Amino acid sequence: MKIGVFVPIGNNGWLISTHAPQYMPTFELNKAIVQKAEHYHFDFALSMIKLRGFGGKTEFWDHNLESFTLMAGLAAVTSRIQIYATAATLTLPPAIVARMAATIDSISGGRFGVNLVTGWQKPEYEQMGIWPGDDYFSRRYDYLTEYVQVLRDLWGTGKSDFKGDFFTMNDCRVSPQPSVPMKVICAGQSDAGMAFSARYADFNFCFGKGVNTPTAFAPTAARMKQAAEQTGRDVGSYVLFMVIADETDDAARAKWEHYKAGADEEALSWLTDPTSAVNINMGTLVGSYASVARMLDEVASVPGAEGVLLTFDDFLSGIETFGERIQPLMQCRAHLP
Ligand SMILES: Cc1cc2nc3c(=O)[nH]c(=O)nc-3n(C[C@H](O)[C@H](O)[C@H](O)COP(=O)(O)O)c2cc1C
């Protein structure tokens, strides 16, 4: 199974708690994280794009870097890990994304790909006057289909004459073309989103589910395999989890409970053994290094699951303990050096 790191482009990562680590997203922090992930043979690093935060005591996601420029900088200081940026497709013309992708292909020597998102949180767009209206909720994958057609023309041939409802290309040109086939990834959970992914993506990201129920996402990965059957394309599932690991199950549980006890309720308001809002009800693996290794090996056995995208409570120590204590016990990582 492949392992990626979801890099903290927003302050405080994925914990909405006064008891969680408090930190700003800097370049040098994301550089340290990605160089340590690459050292431990992580396969990829992805950044999201988040254009508005949730406030509260922790100013949660009020502070966020931009994904293409962050990943261009990270590409320059790495050599092997795959680098993915997220395009909020309402915010960038497709010929600009095409050229940014060819640029980071150049920086990285062919390690770059794009996560294409529709956007769904109206305020991120309404705040800058570019929300297309509430018809977007139902038509957004029609928009994304035209967007990706323009991208595939430009990457594949260097030109597009595409004409649709949303885009008009009149001999649009982007060269250079990427040195390797450009990877497109999607994070579609809906039927329309999975249908898009099945037609155009290399793989689809989905949410891990529950606390210490690693296989609870299986129905989502089954729906995505069904969507991929309809195109005949091999489009696997990469599943998002948070890992809270320690020397013992009891020690990891104590950390998780300490984070939940600090929940930043004002920030959680704006956003509105169970999952907790403290990490946006993310799929969570809480245990000893050995327990987390066993639970990740169970993820690897789910039909359609090809990888995991990981967040941690503390990225610098969480990547280190992952590489030193968890990954060496994982049957699904026995292929590493
Ligand atoms: C790993 C992951 C990363 C995501 N990143 C973003 C992002 O950066 N920006 C964004 O607007 N939406 C993001 N999303 C939301 C998805 O693109 C998508 O809208 C959501 O999964 C709901 O599916 P649907 O679009 O098919 O309803 C992400 C989802 C997942 C699972």
Mutate to test the pocket of ligand 1, among 115, 120, 136 (most ligand atoms within 8 A of CB): 120
Contacts of 315 (CB under 8 A, 6+ apart): 5, 7, 8, 13, 29, 33
Contacts of 68 (CB under 8 A, 6+ apart): 85, 87, 97, 100, 104
- Long-range pairs, 186-189, Cβ under 8 A, ≥24: 186/115, 186/116, 186/117, 187/115, 187/117, 188/141, 189/220
- For ligand 1, atom 22: residue with the closest CA: 189
Q: Which two tokens stand for residue 164?
A: 């649709």
- What is the stated resolution of the deposited model, in angstroms? 1.8
Tokens 């595409």 belong to 162
- For this PDB entry, the determination method is X-ray
> Among 173, 302, 180, which residue's Cα sits nearest to residue 237?
302
d(CA 214, CA 333): 17
d(CA 7, CA 145): 27
CB 29 within 8 A of CB 8: yes
Q: For residue 119, is it left (φ>0), alpha (ψ between -120 and 50) or beta?
A: left
Where are the extended beta strands (E) located within 81-129?
82-88, 112-117
> Among 174, 237, 183, which residue's Cα sits nearest to residue 206?
237
CA 230 to chain centre: 25
**Total domain count, the chain:** 1
Q: Following CA atoms 241, 244, 247, 248 in sequence, which dihedral angle do they give, to the nearest 10 degrees?
A: -90
> Among 291, 268, 266, which residue's Cα sits nearest to residue 278?
268
User: Is 189's C-beta closer than 6 angstroms to any atom of ligand 1?
Assistant: yes
d(CA 169, CA 160): 6
Q: Which two tokens stand for residue 71?
A: 């990943």
CB 295 within 8 A of CB 331: no
User: Is 206's C-beta closer than 6 angstroms to any atom of ligand 1?
Assistant: yes
- For ligand 1, atom 9: residue with the closest CA: 49
d(CA 100, CA 107): 10
CB 325 within 8 A of CB 292: no
d(CA 311, CA 284): 9
- The residue type of 142 is D
| Nearest atom, ligand 1, residue 121 CA | 11
For residue 335, count other CB atoms closer than 10 A to its CB.
Answer: 7
Question: Which residues constitute the domain of residue 211?
Answer: 2-333
Q: Is the peptide bond before 123 cis (omega within 30 degrees of 0)?
A: no
What length does the chain have? 337
User: Is 118's C-beta closer than 6 angstroms to any atom of ligand 1?
Assistant: yes
CA distances from 247 to 114, 157, 231, 256, 326 (A): 36, 53, 45, 14, 10
For residue 123, count other CB atoms closer than 10 A to its CB.
Answer: 10
User: Is 49's C-beta closer than 6 angstroms to any atom of ligand 1?
Assistant: yes
Coil, strand, or helix at residue 117?
Answer: strand
Angle at 193 between CA 120 and CA 73, to 5 degrees: 65
Contacts of 335 (CB under 8 A, 6+ apart): none
- The residue type of 211 is V
| Nearest atom, ligand 1, residue 193 CA | 26
CA distances from 208 to 39, 98, 101, 156 (A): 25, 30, 28, 34
> Among 287, 185, 310, 295, which residue's Cα sits nearest to residue 240?
310
| Nearest atom, ligand 1, residue 192 CA | 26
CB 126 within 8 A of CB 133: no
**279 in a labelled binding site:** no
The CATH code of the domain that includes 219 is 3.20.20.30
d(CA 26, CA 263): 24
**141 in a labelled binding site:** yes
Helix axes 136-157, 191-200, angle to 10 degrees: 10
CB 323 within 8 A of CB 257: no
- The residue type of 212 is N
Q: Which DSSP helix (H) or strand (E) runs through 306?
A: strand 305-312
